[PDB]
C-alpha cells in the first residue's frame, strides 16, 4: 500500500510502500537460427509460383549477406542541475554480452554449439574460455528450405510448388528479414528485445530454464515487458549454416526491499519586492531502495520503471549511499548526513506531480490552483511551497500549465513545519551554490 | 512572415513572426477491437490451407495471451547549463489516460461500452465515475472469425477454405499482431 | 547569400528559410565590467545577481 | 585478468578488448591544495580559475 | 509422367503437396487410358471403327 508524506519545511515529498526489483547482473544466452547455405537457384522455369519462391529466396540471401556485413563489426552502444545524475559512474552495458559474442568467433565454437542443438532445441554449452551458456534454436530455415524447397531450387526441373508453400515460406522467412531489419538500423545491438528477436513463448521458456530462484522466475514472467526493456540483443556471428546472436537478460539480485520516491521543488522566501528573495532546493530527488545495509539511489527518472507497487531499477545508474541519507527527509539539519541542496535567487513558479498528490511552488504573480473535474477550483495556493493530495483533486494549474494528478489510491500526510529558507539571513546567503549541501552553505 | 533581429550587445538573436499551437490539455478516447473468443480448433484435417489458417489463428491466440499479460500491469512512462530546463516542473504525462484506463477495469464498464458499439462503430459512453468519452470500434475480428472461419474451426469437418480467405485473414489479423507488437516493447504505452 | 558557416573544424549549413534579418548594432555589454572584480563562477545567475 | 568491478551495490562488467594498459604513478593533485582556502563551489572551472 | 511428376506424392509418407495445375494435368493425361479401357470393356476387347 502506497503512502506519501509532504514536508512543508523543505518543500519535498516522499512516497513509501514500494517493493524493489533491481537489475544487479546479467545473464547471457545464445540464440540460434539454422540457415540453409544456398547459392544457385537452378531453374529456368518462368512459372509465377516459382518466381515468387525465387523472389523470397532472394530476400533470404540478401539478409544473410547483410548480416555477414554486420558480423564484421564490433558491437557497441552508448548507455539536469536539479538532479544528481552527474555524480554517477560510467558503465559498459553490453560488455558481458560482447565478451560472449567474441568467444563465438573462435573456430570450433560455432560447430560446438551446432552439435549441442542437433537433437534438441535447447542445451547448455561449455565455451572454450570456460563459460557455460543456455543455447537455443528458435528457427530452422535450413530444414524447411532443404525439405520443402530443394527440388524447386537444386534442379532444372523444378517441379512447381503448391501455392500454400509459397505462402508458408514467406511466413517463415519473414522473421529472419525482421531480425536483420532491426540489427541493420541499430548497428547490431537492439534494446528492448523484440518478439521477432525472442517471442513471448521463447522468453518465458528461457526464463523457466534459467537456473535462477523461483521468485526471480515468477518476477520475470509476470513482467516480461519490463524484462524486454532491460535486455539487449547482440548480433554475433553468421557462419557455417547458423546465425547466432547473444541475448543479454537482466539478473535481479535484489527483490522486495522497501523503496521510496523523493520529490523536490524550489523553496523561496516570499517578499513583495521582486528580486529580494532567496531560494533553496533539495537536489537529491529520485528513487531510493534499501540494498545490502546501504541505500541504492537513482537520480534519473529513466532508470526506474514502476509496475503497480514494484520498482524496476538498474544499479548501473545508481549511487550507493549510507542509510542515513533518509534523515534528510526527517531532519535536513541532522549531524549524520550532509543533505544536498542548491541555492538561487530565481523564484519561478512550478509544480511537481507526486505519486499521491502535487507539490506547488507558487511565487510572484503566478495563478496557482487545484481543481476537481465536477466542482472546478477548490484551492487557491498562496505564495510559497504548498501541497495537495490526489484525493478529491484531478488537476493542478500553475500559470499557463495544467497538470493532471495521478489517481493512484493511497493516503497522504501533510507534515507542517517552518520553511527552512526563513532561517537564513539574506544579507550573507550564498545564492550561487549550484551544487551544494547544508554544511557547505 | 518570419523576421529576425541580432543584438550585438548581448550576442543573441530573436526570430519573430510565428503562430502558436500549444497543447494545454488532453482528450481521451477509447479504441476497441472486437475479438473472437476461441480456444479449440477442432480439426484433424491436414490440408495445407487449413494448416495456414491454424497457424494464423495461433498467432491470434498468442497475441491475445500476450495482451492479457500486459493488461496485468499499470501503464507508466518517463516524460544542459546553457538552458533553463532545470527550472521546469515535473508532470505526469499519461495521468489522464491512465485514470480513464482504470475505470475500464471496473466490472460492467466493459459490457457498457460493448452495448454502445453494438449497432454503430462510433459512440459516446457515460462511465461509472461520471465521465463521457468517445468510443470507437476500428476492427471486428470477432465478426470475421465467426462468419468466415467457424466451419473450419468449430467442426471436425472442416470444409477446406478458399485460398483467398487464407490471404484475407492474414491481412485482417496483421493489425492485431502489430498493435500487440508495439505495446509489448513499450510496456503498454506508445508514442507517437 | 550565405549557405554555410565554418567555425574551426565544424561546418554548419544555414537554414534557407525566406525572411528579413536586422543587425542591431551595439556595444558588447561584456565591455562594461571590470575583470578585476568580475565573478566568473556564476553558473546560473542574472544581471542583478552579478 | 579482471572481468568485473564492484563499487558499493553496483557491479560493472569491464570491456574485454585486447590491449596494454600503463599505470602512471603520481601524487594526487588534490593533496596540493589547502582546504582552508579551497573553493569547492566551482561547478564549471579550470586550473587557473581555481 | 507418374514417375517424374507424381512419385514424391505417392512413394513417400511426405508427400509434398502438388500444385493444382498438376492435378489438372494428370487427369488430362490419364483420361485417354480410361476411355480406351472404356471402349474395350463394352466391346469385348475388339472395337471398330
Ligand atoms: Cl497450387
Ligand atoms: Cl498532464
Ligand atoms: Cl549541417
Ligand atoms: Cl555491466
Numbering used by the authors:
A (entry chain F): 27 to 105, 134 to 495
B (entry chain F): 27 to 105, 134 to 246
C (entry chain F), D (entry chain F): 446 to 495
E (entry chain F): 198 to 246
What text comes from the article?
The RSV fusion glycoprotein (RSV F) is an attractive vaccine antigen, since it is the principal target of RSV neutralizing antibodies in human sera. RSV F fuses the viral and host cell membranes by irreversible protein refolding from the labile prefusion conformation to the stable postfusion conformation. Like other class I fusion proteins, the inactive precursor, RSV F0, requires cleavage during intracellular maturation by a furin-like protease. RSV F contains two furin sites, which leads to three polypeptides: F2, p27 and F1, with the latter containing a hydrophobic fusion peptide at its N terminus.
To characterize the prefusion RSV F protein, the double mutant SC variant with the optimized apex (N67I, S215P: SC-DM) and the triple mutant variant with the extra substitution that reduced repulsion in the RR2 domain (N67I, S215P and E487Q: SC-TM) were purified and analysed. Structures of SC-TM (N67I, S215P and E487Q) and the processed variant with the optimized apex PR-DM (N67I, S215P) were determined to 2.4 and 2.3 Å, respectively. In the SC-TM structure, electron density for parts of the flexible loop that connects F2 and F1 was observed within the central cavity of the trimer. As the C terminus of F2 entered the trimeric cavity, electron density became weaker, and linker residues QARGSG could not be accurately placed due to the disorder. After this gap, density became better ordered, allowing linker residues in the turn (SGRS) to be accurately placed. Overall, the conformation adopted by the turn allowed residues in the fusion peptide to remain in the same favourable conformations as those observed in the processed structure. The third stabilizing mutation, E487Q, which was only present in the SC construct, does not result in a substantial change in side chain conformation. However, conformational changes are observed for Phe488 and Asp489, with the side chain of the former adopting a different rotamer in the SC-TM structure. It is unclear as to whether this conformational change is due to the E487Q mutation or to the presence of the SC loop, which packs against the alternate Phe488 side chain.
